[PDB]
Write a structure and sequence with these properties.
The structure is cut from a larger assembly and holds chains A (about 625 residues) and B (about 80 residues).
Chain A (H helix, E strand, L loop, with lengths): L1 H13 L3 H7 L4 H7 L4 E3 L2 E3 L1 H7 L3 H11 L7 E4 L4 E5 L1 H7 L3 H10 L13 H8 L2 H9 L14 H7 L3 H9 L14 H8 L2 H9 L13 H7 L3 H7 L8 H15 L7 H15 L27 H6 L4 H16 L7 H13 L3 H16 L7 H15 L6 H24 L5 H22 L6 H16 L10 H5 L20 H9 L14 H5 L10 H10 L23 H10 L4 H10 L11 H9 L1
Antiparallel strand pairs in A: 1-2, 3-4
Chain B lengths: L22 H12 L7 E2 L25 E2 L6
Antiparallel strand pairs in B: 1-2
The chains are: A mainly alpha (about 625), B mainly alpha (about 80).
Chain lengths: ~625, ~80
């Protein structure tokens, strides 16, 4: 009976009707309910045959089961849309979500739950306007659908339809007595979603419907969101609201041109100056009632600029391409206060542009400022460290000096970021810790790239001491990957991935310099990984003793100089001499090996399995475990 | 036969030893140009170190090649 259940589920999903009727033909009432209502997993969806028929738009299959076999309309199933997972959605929810009007009309006629809510409080009317089908939206509302019902994020049907490019469902929802003042979890209203997306027609319907613009949970006016979204047309759509005052209008015009100054998709030099020209001109209109901008103090990251407080100052930089990009960052940050989640992106793009123009000092300053502004906000600053390593490797690859305090500043940020990432591994449960573990491993790799960059710089003694102090701090915070690898283990491992983006041409693993610099800073050289391998076990696994012999020799003498126990044995009972796989590496180990009766006695004890616990010194049990 | 053995900084060592010359003193001539004494240049013959007489035919009798030598001290 279970074998036929897969074919019945397949028959409903594939749209075949004659075979489905034949399979269900001559079946008792017990077999009808079991076959129609049994969930099956296919493509990550635990959906009933009726639900998958509505999701796949098989109205005839739905009509056959609903009208004849009397299958329930309240079954709950999990579906997989374009990047979204919805669980507990009935067949009406899937039919409306899939945009199949010929299936929606059949379920409501049989008595489907029009006001059904999924796990994340999702309405079939919300799904219909999410898909953009007006016919399903109009039919569902006329069939007693609650428009005001929102999700767990307090997003109503109008708000989600306001984000997507579906104006027809928005116009019908607005005229169907829908609240335009409903706020999301972060205070975002329907106009907030439209401002970010940039729907001209949708916004015009909202202001006519008494939109009553309000700030969101971040205190961000959606008029300034469009300015922040490089939505030029949307900015000059709400200025005529007759209640936006004067100061707010200045803040919107300043932000829009500044956003145009620093954005990859919406870069233009003519609208950069023009939008800032009118905003400062409107300031210099009353004369005796001047509205002087509260200019932030100049930041060394932004050169020595203090914005433009006069009309003639901005005119002097009308044709200045470097200033217009730089000025846009200052005014945008001054408006935003650097607390927004998107303030750093124009800064990082301007730094990327400067780096792509072989201008390194300015890009380094801007990227450092962006990294500080993101780390103060507790963001996932791992790709930022990765691009820091990439730009430093490109700077040293083009044979130019690197500012050591700038290296110290990013190093000081990396060591503090790792502690935050170390907390993210422990604090976060087994839901996103797999991605957090990858991010923390990437952070360790970026730290290794930074130290490898430091091994090539001139490293003035004060700056070198600062770098060594930062590395000492990180080492004493015991940075360990999921494999048990410390900084030394990865620094002596050729299998540690080096970034291909402008970095693998500079950072080479294993590197004897970084290991040396990791031993002068005091790394625990006898550290054990998950496999029990130390740094000496890992380095002798290197399979390239001819291509780079010195990077295998000058590291080994660097490894066994602080007390790397050459005879210490891994979890799988392998001496590093045993894990040689190379005559050169084993002869180097033999030359560097010094015998000790401690080692011979411990090896003889473990080779005969004499009970030593609670008979030998406590520090000697670990030594026995070494061999 | 002249040698082109690599060193700690990609240098060269002129052994000037034929394939029938034993490596007991052949490494001394190579290290004579570099500076190392005879019983200190623990050279690696592309996988192993020569011991006792160690006629050069053991190391494939290669001409010149690149023999990375170890700087092992106190071996005198």
């Amino acid at each position: 009976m279970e074998g036929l259940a897969g074919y019945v589920y397949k028959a409903a999903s594939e749209g075949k009707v004659l075979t489905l009727a034949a399979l269900l033909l001559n079946r008792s009432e017990s077999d009808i309910r079991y076959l129609l209502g049994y969930v099956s997993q296919q493509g990550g969806q635990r959906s009933t045959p009726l639900i998958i028929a509505a999701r796949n738009g098989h109205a005839k299959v739905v009509r056959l089961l609903l009208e004849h076999y009397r299958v329930q309309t309240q079954q709950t199933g999990t579906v997989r849309f374009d990047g979204y997972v919805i669980d507990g959605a009935t067949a009406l929810w899937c039919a409306a979500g899939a945009g199949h009007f010929e299936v929606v009309k059949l379920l409501v006629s049989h008595g489907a739950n029009v006001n059904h809510t999924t796990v994340t409080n999702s309405t079939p009317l919300r799904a219909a306007c999410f898909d953009g089908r007006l016919d399903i939206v109009k039919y569902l509302v006329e069939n007693n659908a609650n428009i005001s019902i929102a999700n767990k994020y307090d997003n109503t049907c109008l708000m989600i339809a306001a984000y997507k490019g579906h104006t027809d469902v928005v116009r019908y929802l607005l005229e169907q007595r829908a609240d335009p003042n409903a706020k999301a979890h972060c205070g975002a209203t329907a106009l907030h979603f439209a401002a970010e997306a940039g729907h001209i027609d949708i916004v015009k319907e909202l202001i006519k419907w008494r939109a009553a613009i309000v700030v969101n949970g971040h205190g961000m006016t959606p008029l300034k969101v469009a300015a922040e979204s490089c939505k030029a047309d949307v900015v000059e759509l709400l200025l005529s609201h007759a209640d936006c005052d004067r100061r707010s209008r200045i803040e919107a015009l300043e932000l829009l041109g500044a956003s145009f100054a620093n954005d990859r998709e919406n870069y233009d030099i003519i609208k950069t100056y023009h939008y800032l020209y009118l905003a400062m001109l409107e300031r210099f209109q009353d004369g005796d009632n001047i509205l002087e901008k509260e200019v932030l103090p100049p930041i060394h990251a932004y050169g020595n600029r203090t914005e433009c407080r006069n009309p003639q100052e901005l005119e002097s930089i009308r044709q200045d391409r470097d200033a217009l990009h730089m000025e846009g960052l200052i005014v945008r940050e001054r408006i935003l206060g650097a607390d927004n989640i998107d303030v750093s992106h124009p800064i990082i793009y301007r730094g990327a542009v400067y780096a792509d123009n072989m201008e390194f000092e300015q890009c380094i300053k801007l990227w450092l400022h962006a990294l500080h502004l993101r780390q103060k906000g507790n963001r996932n600053t791992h790709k930022d460290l990765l691009r820091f390593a990439q730009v430093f490797s490109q700077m040293i690859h083009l044979n130019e000096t690197v500012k050591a305090p700038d290296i110290e500043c990013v190093l000081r940020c990396s060591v503090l970021e790792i502690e935050q990432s170390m907390n993210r591994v422990k604090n976060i449960s087994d839901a996103d810790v797999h991605n957090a573990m990858d991010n923390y491993e990437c952070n360790l790799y970026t730290f290794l790239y930074l130290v490898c960059i430091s091994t090539k710089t001139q490293c003035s003694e004060e700056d070198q001491c600062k770098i060594n102090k930062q590395i000492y701090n990180l080492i004493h915070l015991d940075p360990r990957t999921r494999e048990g690898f410390t900084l030394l283990h990865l620094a002596v491992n050729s299998n540690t991935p080096v970034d291909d983006f402008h970095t693998n041409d500079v950072c080479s693993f294993p590197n004897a310099l970084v290991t040396k610099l990791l031993l002068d800073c005091g790394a625990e050289v006898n550290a054990v990984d998950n496999e029990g391998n130390s740094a000496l076990h890992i380095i002798v696994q290197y399979n390239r003793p001819i291509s780079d012999f010195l990077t295998l020799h000058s590291i080994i003498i660097s490894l066994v100089e602080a007390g790397a126990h050459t005879d210490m044995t891994n979890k799988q009972n392998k001496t590093p001499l045993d894990k040689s796989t190379t005559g050169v590496s084993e002869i180097l180990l033999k030359t560097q090996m010094k015998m000790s009766l401690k080692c011979l006695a411990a090896r003889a004890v473990r080779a005969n399995d004499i009970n030593y616990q609670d008979q030998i010194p406590r520090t000697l049990e670990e030594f026995v475990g070494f061999h | 036969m002249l040698i082109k053995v690599k060193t700690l900084t990609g240098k060269e060592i002129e052994i000037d030893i034929e394939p029938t010359d034993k490596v007991e003193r052949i490494k001394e001539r190579v290290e004579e140009k570099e500076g190392i004494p005879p019983q200190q240049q623990r050279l690696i013959y592309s996988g192993k170190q020569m011991n006792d007489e160690k006629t050069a035919a053991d190391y494939k009798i290669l001409g010149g090649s690149v023999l990375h030598l170890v700087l092992a001290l106190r071996g005198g």
